Amino acid sequence: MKFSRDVTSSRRKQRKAHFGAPSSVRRVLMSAPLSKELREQYKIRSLPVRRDDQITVIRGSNKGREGKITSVYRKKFLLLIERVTREKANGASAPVGIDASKVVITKLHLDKDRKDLIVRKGGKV
């Protein structure tokens, strides 16, 4: 149970906060769990998704499909993956969006900021 009176358990206010969040908040809202190997190597359970991240789909119809994150569509809380698409009537392949919580990160797109973030969350690089 929550005890702080600074956090609201109102469904009206929690839904309003999630569906009216700015893009800075939406960055943390779309986080994905790291794979077991990365979990024990980076000492981090989950990370926000970023472009060029190598992920595996865990749930849904596209379960098992691997690929890089081609674009993080924050306005819809969706991830776009390479070659994970759907055929249209005219033959053009329409990309399929997968929720960030339904994928697992198997390889991180490490940069200077991500390494500092890793050691910030108690993580050995």
Partner 1 sequence: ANPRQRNKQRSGKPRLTRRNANKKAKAKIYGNFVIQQNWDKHATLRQNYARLGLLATPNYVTGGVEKLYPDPTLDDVLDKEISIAPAKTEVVRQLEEEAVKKAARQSNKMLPLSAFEHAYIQRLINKYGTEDFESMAKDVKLNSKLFNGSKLKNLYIRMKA
Partner 2 sequence: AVSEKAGGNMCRSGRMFAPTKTWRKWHVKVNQNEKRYAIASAVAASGVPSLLLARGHRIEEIPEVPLVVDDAVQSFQKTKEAVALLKEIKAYRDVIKVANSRKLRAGKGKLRNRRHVQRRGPLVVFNEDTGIVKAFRNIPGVEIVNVRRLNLLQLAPGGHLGRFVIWTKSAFGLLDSVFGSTTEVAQLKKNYFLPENIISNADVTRLINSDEIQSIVKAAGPSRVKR
Q: Which residues bind partner 1 (CB under 8 A)?
A: 4-6, 22
Name the minimum Å distance from CB 125 to RNA. 14
Name the minimum Å distance from CB 79 to RNA. 9
Q: Beta strand 66-73 with 78-87: parallel, antiparallel or unpaired?
A: antiparallel
Determine, following the binding rule CB under 7 A, whether residue 19 of this chain makes contact with RNA.
yes
Q: Which two tokens stand for residue 41?
A: 């190597």
Q: Binding residues for RNA, how many (CB under 7 A)? A: 74
Specify whether the CB–CB gap between 44 and 119 falls below 8 A.
no
Q: In the complex, which residues of this chain contact partner 2 (CB under 8 A)?
A: 1, 9-11
Name the minimum Å distance from CB 10 to RNA. 4
Helix (H, G, I), strand (E, B) or coil at 72: strand
Q: Which helix (H) or strand (E) holds 93?
A: strand 93-98
Q: Which is nearer to partner 2, 11 or 120 (CB)?
A: 11
Q: How far is CA 104 from the centre of its chain?
A: 8
